[PDB]
Design a protein around this ligand. Structure first.
Ligand SMILES: NC(=O)c1ccc[n+]([C@H]2O[C@@H](COP(=O)(O)OP(=O)(O)OC[C@@H]3O[C@H](n4ccc(N)nc4=O)[C@H](O)[C@@H]3O)[C@@H](O)[C@H]2O)c1
Ligand SMILES: NC(=O)c1ccc[n+]([C@H]2O[C@@H](COP(=O)(O)OP(=O)(O)OC[C@@H]3O[C@H](n4ccc(N)nc4=O)[C@H](O)[C@@H]3O)[C@@H](O)[C@H]2O)c1
Lengths: 374, 374
């Protein structure tokens, strides 16, 4: 078989020879009982850079020693990209949401041998599922591989915005001291009201991590949590999003992007926020109107905004969230820590081994098989 | 009835006219039951900048309407300072540990009217206690006012160091993207081993906030925690610090500085740390050999160091910790958020009202009284 795998670029100084540490913490299962990936073997050491072109998700020896071919590229955009060239006879396509190779209807029509569309990570929005259903292509992803990673990133950003970490560190780095300059915008998080807009895997993991900070927890979602869970975390439920914003000091978005949530944070809905609110968005860039957010921070309607998701992505060089007041942005990285990469490279190999050996792919990995069967 | 009060400078662009939010979260008590300060009244709005020269801890109208004088300065260092000149007849001296007016033996000898040494915050380290005992000066502090603030700062720095937040935010800020450059030094915190060197007010608050991150918790102390707390937080006790270091991925220092702890982190003890360990130090700068820490980051033995405490303070513009690799420094600020300032400005006024009216200062505020430690 031919496996076509799209990854992001190696670092500026090259593929790293050494790493900061030797191994990764041992983990058995995700919250809720789903066990971590179980490939038969792996050909990488956990903690290596796996999501760049030279990392190859640790796949080449396993594939080439089994008669398969592996094409790894970072060129994914347009009809004359390496990706679209190699796609016509590829059996398997793999990409990460951090550099996704879009499987449009027209691309899937051209992919004569395509049988498996694999997401190395979480989030198959780059794959047209109706075309996969019609064409009998399996669509899978490494469920849960980076939900905890993103949750950590969220709480880190909450603390950093509220306490004014990033300008304070800049004073230290640039040779200043300037205590009043640092803390004129610095508060404690304690006893603030903090809401999450969804509360699925990331939203719940964020709520658990916030609880011992003695914040008052709020959430909204289409489907209420078991009030057993509501009782343990002392959650206030809001049936609608617009009800939750006004009572929150901090709001984190952990909701999927689709037409009803597109630009859900806009000039109109930002006026429902308490003056000086904080928003953290590690979900999707287009949940927020780019310029409404920028206006809110210049006017002080928000006192901070942080996230790793942008629109468009990758963010253009002059994108306003890069330099607006009190931003805590990173590039799109939160689910591709070296830790997460080890889990989803292993998950990728587990799915490939099942697929080539004709064994069942884990039901929790599946999105499409014959039909929208998860 | 002369109050000499030393505060830090206003922000470089002047004392603020507006603030990010209108109020502060409501808090009743500290962990363990101690109530927040209870002055008869306050002449500030909580959330205002009170610890700088124009904030005056909100004290002027209360002192002056009672016939006292208030002298506020930021010039405190050495014999030619405003502070030394005003000290000769001050009855009350007030100082924050973020900008401390040192009451050395020689200075206290010159302070002919000195009756009360008040710390606007936590940490009588700047006051020679034997001199205060010998001269019957009362020494008091606003106990617990910023313990939670520092604990939040610790967890914030741990997450930032492990996930490589600060260089990632620089890539975003400067117009780049560079996913592999961001994450070649980024890990999850989950299931790491994290140890605190002591488990007092801050150390226990740090441990409680770390628990839902699913880390493995470790601690040292002269006195063990109660067995019920050990099992509630699933703590591993270590009898010596040196016995704790080799199993920790993260070590946070929450211990006072005195001879047995000075330079306790040095070229020799650093060889006990795991490769790629992180250190956070919001305690005191001189707990660490300054150049040994920098050497350990330059040579790749430590994956990160962060804190808000330095030696000396303020840090000179070329202090090595400002620019050494993988540092997360701020200036000394973690206990002077606008939230914390509101508590210790209220407590400062409470203590002053007690002292001038002859009512007993709270026992938990007292360090020295009546010629003895108390
Ligand atoms: N590297 C990254 O930045 C990164 C990494 C991983 C994932 N993601 C992003 O992609 C999403 C997945 O996040 P998720 O938590 O992993 O997904 P899920 O568990 O299915 O979500 C809970 C659900 O919310 C729902 N819902 C749905 C529609 C609606 N109109 N209202 C609702 O309320 C429904 O009820 C359910 O609770 C976003 O969260 C965001 O994180 C980004
Ligand atoms: N803005 C800031 O950065 C800031 C703010 C407030 C305070 N501070 C700093 O000044 C200290 C107070 O911190 P603390 O936790 O408030 O003080 P405490 O409750 O008395 O300490 C727990 C004790 O540890 C002890 N101990 C002692 C000696 C020894 N050889 N072994 C031990 O084990 C003993 O056992 C007990 O548990 C440092 O911690 C650091 O935080 C910094």
């Amino acid at each position: 078989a031919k496996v076509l795998c799209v990854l992001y670029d190696d670092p500026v100084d090259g593929y790293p020879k050494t790493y900061a540490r030797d191994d990764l913490p041992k983990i058995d299962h995700y919250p809720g009982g789903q066990t971590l990936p179980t490939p038969k073997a792996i050909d990488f050491t956990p903690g290596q850079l796996l999501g760049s072109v030279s990392g190859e998700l640790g796949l080449r020896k396993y594939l080439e020693s089994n008669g398969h071919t592996l094409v790894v590229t970072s060129d994914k955009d347009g009809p004359d990209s390496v990706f679209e060239r190699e796609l016509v006879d590829a059996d398997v396509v793999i990409s990460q949401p951090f550099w996704p190779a879009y499987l449009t209807p027209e691309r899937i029509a051209k992919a004569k041998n395509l049988k498996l569309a694999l997401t190395a990570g979480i989030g198959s929005d780059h794959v047209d599922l109706q075309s996969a259903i019609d064409r009998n292509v399996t669509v899978a992803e490494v469920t849960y591989c980076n939900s905890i990673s993103v949750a950590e990133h969220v709480v880190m950003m909450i603390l950093s915005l509220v306490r004014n970490y990033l300008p304070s560190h800049e004073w230290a780095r640039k040779g200043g001291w300037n205590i009043a300059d640092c803390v004129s915008h610095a508060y404690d998080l304690e006893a603030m009201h903090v809401g999450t807009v969804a509360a699925g895997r990331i939203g719940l993991a964020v709520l658990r991590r916030l609880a011992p900070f003695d914040v008052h927890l709020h959430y909204t979602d289409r489907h209420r949590l078991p009030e057993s869970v509501e009782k343990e975390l002392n959650l206030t439920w809001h049936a609608t999003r617009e009800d939750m914003y006004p009572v929150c000091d901090v709001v984190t978005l952990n909701i999927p992007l689709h037409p009803p949530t597109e630009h859900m944070i806009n000039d109109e809905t930002l006026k429902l926020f308490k003056r000086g609110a904080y928003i953290v968005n590690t979900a999707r860039g287009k949940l927020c109107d780019r310029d409404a957010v920028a206006r809110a921070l210049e006017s002080g309607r928000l006192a901070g905004y942080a996230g790793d998701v942008w629109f468009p992505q990758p963010a253009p060089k002059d994108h306003p969230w890069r330099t607006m007041p009190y931003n805590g942005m990173t590039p799109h990285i939160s689910g591709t820590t070296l830790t997460a990469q080890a889990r989803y490279a292993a998950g990728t190999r587990e799915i490939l081994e099942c697929f080539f050996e004709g064994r069942p792919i884990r039901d929790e990995y599946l999105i499409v098989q014959g039909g929208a069967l998860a």
